Design a protein around this nucleic acid. Structure first.
Lengths: 83, 91, 97, 14, 106, 91, 107, 81, 95
DNA sequence: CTGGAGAATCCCGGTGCCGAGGCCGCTCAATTGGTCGTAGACAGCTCTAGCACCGCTTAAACGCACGTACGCGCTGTCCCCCGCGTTTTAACCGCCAAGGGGATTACTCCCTAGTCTCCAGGCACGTGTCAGATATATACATCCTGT
DNA sequence: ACAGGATGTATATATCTGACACGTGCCTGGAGACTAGGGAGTAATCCCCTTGGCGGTTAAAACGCGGGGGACAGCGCGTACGTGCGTTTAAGCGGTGCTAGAGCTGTCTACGACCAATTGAGCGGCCTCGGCACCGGGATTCTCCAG
C-alpha cells in the first residue's frame, strides 16, 4: 500500500514471451526471464530519474506525459503520439 | 500555435482524395512535423554561429536540409524549396 | 488426440503478434511498477494516466528492440534458443554496459 | 592537498 | 486583400506560423524573409510522401482511415525514411512482419 | 574568447603543483570545456522553453547539471556550485 | 577596486567570460546573475577531477608532463567519466590495454 | 584523375588496427571487407564536411569542418577545436 | 628457432595497445581522401590538420569495430574473426 | 617437463634539444554605477482529474506432465592462416618554388526589426453518420500422423 | 508421399456505434504599410600555406613457403523447453466519491538589460632551459623444444 514491495514479478513469464515473439524468437531458454526483469528495471530507472527532475524543476507534484517525452527525446528514443 | 492538423488534412485530401485519418494518427503527424522543425531550425542555427552571422536565410536552411535528409529526399526537397522561393519573390 | 509439433505453435504466435499492435504487458502490474521506482526519487508523486501509457509503449518498444538483436546473436553461433549470453552481448555492443 | 572533500575518490586505490 | 504568404508562395503550410516559431525560438537574432518560405515547402514535402505511402498501405488493408499501423508500415518499408527516423518509435505502430529464414521448417 | 589554457593551468598547479601539460593535451582540455559548455547551456536553454520562461537562472542550470552528470558527479558539482553562489551573494 | 566577480565566488574560471558567452550564445532572452557563477564552478569541478586523475597517470608512468595518453587512461579508468565521455574520440589517445581472457595461452 | 586508391589501405595496415582492437587471428576475407567500411565511413563524413565548405563559400576543407561533421554524427573528436 | 603461431600475435596486441601512433601510412590516406572528395566537388583543397582529423577519427572508428567484431567471434566459440562478424556487429550497432 | 636456449622486454646512464614556461607590453573586454520596466514571484481561486474503493466477471496466469528436439560435448579432418625469410616498392624526409585563396578592411545599401492598424483565418464547439468492430456461418488451407 | 482428419484461418453478411468530418461563431494572430539602421554584400588588398616537384634513404610492403592449429562437419547423449490441460488468481470494467493540485488571473517589485566611463587582466610576443627522447649497454624475463 505504502512501501509497495516487489512488483517486478508482476511482469510474468507469458508477458515476456509475447514481447519475444514480436522480435521473431522461436525458442526461449528459462534464464531469460530473470534477466529481462533486470534489464527494464535499469531502463525505467534511467527514464524516471530524468522525468522526475523535470517535474521537480517545474515545482509540480504530478508527472505529465510531456515530461516522459522529454526524458525519451533526451536519450535518443523520441516518441510520437503524445505531444 | 496548437496544431498542424488543418494543414495535414489539406495535404491528405490533395494526395489521396478519398482516404481519411484517425485522431491518433493525426497526433503522430502533428508530433512528426514538430520534430523535424527543431531538427532543421535547431541545426541551421548552428550554421549561423559557425560563420559568425546573425540572420537565418534560405541558404542557411538549404545546407541544413542537405545535412539532415538522406539520399533522394535531399535532392527533391532542395528542388522543392527553391521552387517555392522563386514563386514567392516573383509574386 | 491431435498435437502440434514443438515449434509450429511458436511460429503461429510470431505471425500473430507481429501482425497486431496492442500493448502486451498487463497494465495494472506495470502501472504499479512505476510507483515502485518513483518512490526512490521523490515520495508522494502523482501520475497522469497518459504518462504511464507513454512508459509502456516506449519500454515495450525497447524490449522488442532487444529481442530482434538477441535473436540475431543466437542465430549467430548457430542456435535457435536464446541464452542470456545473447542479451549480455547485444547490449554491450550497443554500449549500455 | 587542494580539494579532497570536494573531489570524489573513495574506492579504490588503483 | 489578405493574400497570405502561403497562398503567395503556392504552398499549404502556414508561412506566418513558421516565421513566428523561428523568431520565438531563440534560433538567431534575425530571420530572413525567404527562410520560413523555404521551411514550409520542405515540411509540406516530407508530409506529402508519408501520406503518399501510408495512403497506399491503408488501401492494401481495405481501409480508409489511416491508422498508425499504416504510418509504421509506410516508414519502415522505405529505406530513406528509415535513415531519417531510425531513432524514432511510434505509438501503436508495431513491428514489420519479419521472420528469420533459419527458423522456418525444415 | 580564444582559450581556457590560462585557467586550466591555474587549476593544474593548484591540484598537482609539480606536473605539467603538453600543448596537445591542453588543446584537448580546451575542447573539453567547450563541449560541456553547450551541453549544459544548450540543454538549460530547453528548460526555459519547457516552462515558457525567458531567463536562465542558477536553478535552470542546477537541474541541467542533474540531467547531464551521472552518479556522484551530480552530487558533488551541485554541492560545488551552491557554495559558489552563496559566496558570491554574501560578498 | 577591480574585484573580479570570479574572485568574489572564490573560483578560477572567468565568470565574466562565461556570462558573455551565455548572452551572445542565443540560449535565452535573459541570463540571470547567479547563472554564470553557478556554471563556472561546475566547469572548474570537472577539470579538477580529470587533471587530478591524469596527474596520477603521469606520475605512474614516471613523467612530469601530462600528454594526451594520460587523458585517455584517466577517463576510461572510471565509470562516471567514461559514461560522460562515452562517444568522445581523443586525439592521440590510444586504447586501454585490454586482452580477452579466451585469447590466452593455456597451461 | 585518381585511380583505384582504396588499395593503399594495405593488408598489414588493417592487421595493425585489429591488433590494437585485440584480435588474435584474422581470416582472409576481411581485408577486402574493411575497405568497404572506410568507403562507407568516409563518404558519410566527407559528404557532410564539403557541405560546410560550400556553405561558407570556401575551397579548402578546414579542420573545423571535419569536426563539425563528426560532431553531427555522434563522433565527437577532441584535439582540433 | 621459431615461435608457435599466436604468441607473436599476442605480443603485437601487447604493443599496439600501448602505443598511440597512427597505424595507417599517411600519404596513401591523403590520396584516398582526395579521390572520395573528387566525387562530391571537383578541385578541392585541404588543410593538413583537416586530413589528420580524418585520420584519427577513422582509425578510432575501425578499432571500435574490432573490439566488437572480436566479441562476436568469441560468442561463436571461435578465435578467427570473419566477415560474418563485422556484418553482425555493425548491424546491431545500427548501420 | 626442465632446461639452456635465443630472443626479448626492462633498467640503466648519457647526450641534447626543442618545447614548456615564464617574462614583457598593452589593449580590448570586464567592472562600476546608475536606471528603467518587465519578467516573474505570489496570492487567490476554480475545478479538473487523479487517487481510492467497490464488486463481478473471466481472461489470463499458474502449475503440471510429457516427449522431443535442440544444445553440447566429442572426434576427426584439412586447410587456411601464421611465422619467417627475401626482395621490392614507395613512404618519408628535406628542400624548393609558386600562387591560389583565406583573411582582413572599407563602404554602402538593401533588408529586417519595429510599430500600428486591421481583419479573416483557424480555433472551440458543436452535430449527424458512416467506417469500422463484432458476430456468425462458410469455405478454405493449412499441419500431420499415419499408411 | 498420400490423405483425410483436424485445426486454424480467411470470407461474406449483418448489425451497431461512436469517432470522424463538417459547420459555425468568434477572435487574435497574420498581413499591410511605413520608418530606421545596421548587417551583410562587395571590392580590394595582403600573404599565408597549400600544391607541386625532386632526390635520397630505408623502412615497410609484398611474396613465397611450410606447418599446425583451428574451423567445421558429423555424431550422440539427455535434458531442458514446448504443448496442452486443468486450476486459480487478479486484471479489467464501471461506477462512485473525494480533494489535491494544476491551471489561471491579478498585483507588484526586484532583477536584468542598457548605458557610459574606466582600467588591468589576458593575449601576443620573446626568451630560456630542462624534460623527455634517442642511443647504447647490459639485465632480467618469458618462450621454447629437446630432453
Amino acid at each position: 500500500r505504502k512501501v509497495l514491495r516487489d512488483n517486478i514479478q508482476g511482469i510474468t513469464k507469458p508477458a515476456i514471451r509475447r514481447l519475444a515473439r514480436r522480435g521473431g524468437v522461436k525458442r526461449i531458454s528459462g534464464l531469460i526471464y530473470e534477466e529481462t526483469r533486470g534489464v527494464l528495471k535499469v531502463f525505467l530507472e534511467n527514464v524516471i530519474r530524468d522525468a522526475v527532475t523535470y517535474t521537480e524543476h517545474a515545482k509540480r507534484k504530478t508527472v505529465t506525459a510531456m515530461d516522459v517525452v522529454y526524458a525519451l527525446k533526451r536519450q535518443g528514443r523520441t516518441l510520437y503520439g503524445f505531444g | 500555435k496548437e496544431s498542424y492538423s488543418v494543414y495535414v488534412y489539406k495535404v491528405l485530401k490533395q494526395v489521396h482524395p478519398d482516404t481519411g485519418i484517425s485522431s491518433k494518427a493525426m497526433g503522430i503527424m502533428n508530433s512528426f512535423v514538430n520534430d523535424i522543425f527543431e531538427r532543421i531550425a535547431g541545426e541551421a542555427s548552428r550554421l549561423a554561429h559557425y560563420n559568425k552571422r546573425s540572420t537565418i536565410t534560405s541558404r542557411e536552411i538549404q545546407t541544413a536540409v542537405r545535412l539532415l535528409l538522406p539520399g533522394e529526399l535531399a535532392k527533391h526537397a532542395v528542388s522543392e524549396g527553391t521552387k517555392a522561393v522563386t514563386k514567392y519573390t516573383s509574386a | 488426440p491431435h498435437r502440434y509439433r514443438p515449434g509450429t505453435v511458436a511460429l503461429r504466435e510470431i505471425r500473430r503478434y507481429q501482425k497486431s499492435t496492442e500493448l502486451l504487458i498487463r497494465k495494472l502490474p506495470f502501472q504499479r511498477l512505476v510507483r515502485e521506482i518513483a518512490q526512490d526519487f521523490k515520495t508522494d508523486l502523482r501520475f497522469q494516466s497518459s504518462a504511464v501509457m507513454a512508459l509502456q509503449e516506449a519500454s515495450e518498444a525497447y524490449l522488442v528492440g532487444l529481442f530482434e538483436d538477441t535473436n540475431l546473436s543466437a542465430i549467430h553461433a548457430k542456435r535457435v534458443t536464446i541464452m542470456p549470453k545473447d542479451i549480455q552481448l547485444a547490449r554491450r555492443i550497443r554500449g549500455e554496459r | 592537498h587542494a580539494w579532497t572533500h570536494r573531489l570524489r575518490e573513495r574506492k579504490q586505490l588503483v | 486583400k489578405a493574400k497570405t504568404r502561403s497562398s503567395r508562395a503556392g504552398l499549404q503550410f502556414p508561412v506566418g506560423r513558421v516565421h513566428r516559431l523561428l523568431r520565438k525560438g531563440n534560433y538567431s537574432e534575425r530571420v530572413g524573409a525567404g527562410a520560413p518560405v523555404y521551411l514550409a515547402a520542405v515540411l509540406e514535402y516530407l508530409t506529402a510522401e508519408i501520406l503518399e505511402l501510408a495512403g497506399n498501405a491503408a488501401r492494401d488493408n481495405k481501409k480508409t482511415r489511416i491508422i498508425p499501423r499504416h504510418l509504421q508500415l509506410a516508414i519502415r518499408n522505405d529505406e530513406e525514411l528509415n535513415k531519417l527516423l531510425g531513432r524514432v518509435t511510434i505509438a501503436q505502430g508495431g513491428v514489420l512482419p519479419n521472420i528469420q529464414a533459419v527458423l522456418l521448417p525444415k
